[PDB]
Design a protein around this ligand. Structure first.
Ligand SMILES: O=C(O)C[C@H](NC(=O)c1ncnc2[nH]ccc12)c1ccccn1
Length: 167
């Protein structure tokens, strides 16, 4: 038993809600919140900009030190950093950004990072301003992640569309 509330059950291990991931994180304080990052960990907009703003820019400061030491992530890759005031840990996961011309096939690799964590609060990878088909992303999530994932979808119209089209 865990502390997530009002999530619609999609499968044996995937739950979904129409909610702001920042607000869910501040309420639940999950072990792991997933950030929809880029390879430079430049947290400008979307999930990343919103999470970082909620940490008062501490996420960005930590991320800049990470990049200075380690260099950029790979598309499809991830790193574990602090969750600051939002969670114990933040798993920064890089899904392909279609608006940058990145390989959509890399979405499955991106979701595989979730399997290293027993429970996660996450956004829908590569959706929104990342430019991929969100129905496809939810499908890849359900077909790739085996650990317990709680998906927080910001856009109300998007959430309704995702639920009504889920096979
Ligand atoms: O779920 C959605 O609608 C799409 C989702 N976006 C957000 O969660 C989001 N975007 C902007 N400002 C925000 N403030 C609080 C939440 C939030 C998303 C997923 C992957 C990549 C990019 N974007």
């Amino acid at each position: 038993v865990n502390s997530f509330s009002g999530y619609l059950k999609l499968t044996d291990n995937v739950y979904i809600k129409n909610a702001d991931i920042v607000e869910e994180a501040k309420k639940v304080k999950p072990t792991v919140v997933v950030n929809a990052a880029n390879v430079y960990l430049k947290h400008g907009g979307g999930v990343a900009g919103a999470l970082n703003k909620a940490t008062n820019n501490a996420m960005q400061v930590e991320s800049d030190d990470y990049i200075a030491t380690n260099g950029p992530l790979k598309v499809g890759g991830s790193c574990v950093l602090s969750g600051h005031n939002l969670a114990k840990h933040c798993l920064h996961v890089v899904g392909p950004n279609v608006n940058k011309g990145e390989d959509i096939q890399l979405l499955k690799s991106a979701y595989e990072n979730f399997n290293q964590h027993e429970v996660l609060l996450a956004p829908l990878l590569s959706a929104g301003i990342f430019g991929a088909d969100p129905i496809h992303s939810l499908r890849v999530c359900v077909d790739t992640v085996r650990t317990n994932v709680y998906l927080a979808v910001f856009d109300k119209n998007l959430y309704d569309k995702l639920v009504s089209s889920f096979l």
